[PDB]
Design an enzyme around this catalytic site. Structure first.
Site, PDB file in Angstrom:
ATOM      1  N   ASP A  19      18.626   5.428  -9.114  1.00  0.00           N
ATOM      2  CA  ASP A  19      17.386   6.195  -9.116  1.00  0.00           C
ATOM      3  C   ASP A  19      16.673   6.128  -7.776  1.00  0.00           C
ATOM      4  O   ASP A  19      15.437   6.115  -7.725  1.00  0.00           O
ATOM      5  CB  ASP A  19      16.449   5.784 -10.254  1.00  0.00           C
TER       6      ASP A  19
ATOM      7  N   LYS B 234      14.762   7.269  -4.768  1.00  0.00           N
ATOM      8  CA  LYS B 234      13.912   8.398  -4.412  1.00  0.00           C
ATOM      9  C   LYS B 234      12.574   7.827  -3.954  1.00  0.00           C
ATOM     10  O   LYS B 234      12.253   6.685  -4.272  1.00  0.00           O
ATOM     11  CB  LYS B 234      13.705   9.360  -5.602  1.00  0.00           C
TER      12      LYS B 234
ATOM     13  N   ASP C   7      11.422   0.395 -10.763  1.00  0.00           N
ATOM     14  CA  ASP C   7      12.037   1.229 -11.786  1.00  0.00           C
ATOM     15  C   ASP C   7      13.542   1.080 -11.805  1.00  0.00           C
ATOM     16  O   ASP C   7      14.266   1.792 -11.099  1.00  0.00           O
ATOM     17  CB  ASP C   7      11.614   2.690 -11.663  1.00  0.00           C
TER      18      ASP C   7
ATOM     19  N   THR D 107      17.745  11.776 -10.844  1.00  0.00           N
ATOM     20  CA  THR D 107      16.838  12.864 -10.554  1.00  0.00           C
ATOM     21  C   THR D 107      17.616  13.962  -9.821  1.00  0.00           C
ATOM     22  O   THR D 107      18.383  13.656  -8.896  1.00  0.00           O
ATOM     23  CB  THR D 107      15.682  12.332  -9.673  1.00  0.00           C
TER      24      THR D 107
END
Ligand code: 5AO
Ligand code: 5AO
Ligand code: 5AO
Length: 338
Positions: A154, A156, A172, A189
């Site tokens: 993840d 980002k 996260d 994502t």
């Protein structure tokens, strides 16, 4: 040999915690609720204050019933089992975890500097030295995680917090997984997904190195390399093998990005015989002192502005909703191990 022995000790310490995870190390009424810091389809992150010590924490609260409905059971168990077992300078630390009739709770160190997302959009783009400072931290973090057979999945700007020294702490772990061989879940994502995820392949840590290419591009340009109104349009661009670079990018930056944003996973930097060293030894990183970054001895490009350990100014404002706990246990069996 230095790196070998570091990673051997890292895996020893990870496995001991992995094999005997901590559980039930606090409870909700030990904390006061301060403010909502973020919110999503099955959970939220709250600023809380411990009533006895006065310490602030970021408490991630996941609704067990919504986790089940959205097919995130295994992912939430991954997140907590991994977070309680890891230890690295650029990872947000899990301080406590517990559950109740309705929710799962992960109580993390509070990082008041906010998400890189906000700072990047506010500043427009980061200079190459500034992007490189953050990128180096991600390279080291992925070297650590991958050596533990973990994939992060993840990367980002929203998931990279900036601390009081200007260094990154990754938050996260909802998609992080200890992967036995290869894995298959469609998650992440859209703008950051590697081609092999889009194409429903069994994939490995190479997806994290692809995502690092996306992140570096986004940091240095101000916008990600692949974007569109609809996900399928983003996906067509990702799989195409084509990427355009701003003319202000250096030649070294473009060269690194072509090797990270390599559609053929068997040719992608980070996934070749020399592993992470193809990245660390690339000309774009020639000025990077890898040990000094790890030791947090490099002066950071940017120190977030905040007033103290309880300041929420770098996070934005959300509707303040109840933290309700049912009188009846929900989904007990599914979350036994949490
Ligand atoms: N993922 C997420 C969202 C919003 C705030 C936070 C946060 C702040 N300090 C530690 O974590 C984490
Ligand atoms: N205990 C457990 C659970 C999930 C994955 C793994 C794993 C992956 N590579 C080596 O071990 C181990
Ligand atoms: N995630 C996952 C799925 C199925 C088996 C495993 C696993 C780890 N060690 C032996 O098997 C891990």
């Amino acid at each position: 040999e230095s790196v070998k022995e570091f990673l051997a000790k890292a895996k020893e310490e990870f496995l001991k915690k992995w094999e005997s995870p901590s559980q039930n190390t606090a409870q909700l009424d030990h904390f006061d609720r301060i403010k909502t810091l973020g919110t999503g389809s099955f959970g939220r992150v709250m600023l809380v204050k411990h009533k006895e010590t006065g310490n602030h924490y970021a408490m991630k609260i996941l609704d067990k019933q919504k986790v089940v409905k959205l097919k995130q059971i295994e992912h939430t168990l991954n997140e907590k089992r991994i977070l309680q077992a890891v230890n690295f300078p650029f990872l947000v630390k899990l301080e406590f975890s517990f559950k109740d009739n309705s929710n799962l709770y992960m109580v993390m160190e509070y990082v008041p500097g906010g998400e890189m997302f906000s700072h990047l959009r506010r500043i427009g783009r980061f200079s190459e030295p500034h992007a490189r400072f953050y990128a180096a931290q991600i390279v080291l973090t992925f070297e650590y995680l991958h050596s533990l057979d973990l994939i992060y999945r993840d990367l980002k700007p929203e998931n990279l917090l900036i601390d009081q020294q200007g260094y990154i702490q990754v938050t996260d772990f909802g998609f992080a997984k200890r992967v036995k061989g290869r894995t298959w879940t469609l998650c992440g994502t859209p703008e950051y997904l590697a081609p092999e995820i889009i194409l429903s392949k069994g994939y490995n840590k190479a997806v994290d190195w692809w995502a690092l290419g996306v992140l570096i591009y986004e940091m240095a340009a101000g916008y990600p390399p692949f974007f569109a109104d609809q996900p399928i349009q983003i996906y067509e661009k990702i799989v195409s093998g084509k990427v355009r670079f701003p003319s202000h990018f250096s030649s070294d930056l473009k060269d690194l990005l072509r090797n990270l944003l390599q559609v053929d996973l068997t040719k992608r930097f980070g996934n070749l015989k020399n592993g992470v060293n193809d990245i660390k030894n690339h000309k774009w990183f020639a000025t990077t002192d890898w040990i000094a970054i790890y030791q947090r001895k490099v002066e950071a490009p940017f120190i977030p502005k905040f007033k103290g350990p309880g300041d929420t100014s770098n996070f934005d404002d959300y509707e303040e909703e109840e933290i309700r706990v049912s009188i009846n246990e929900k989904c007990g069996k599914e979350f036994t191990e949490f």
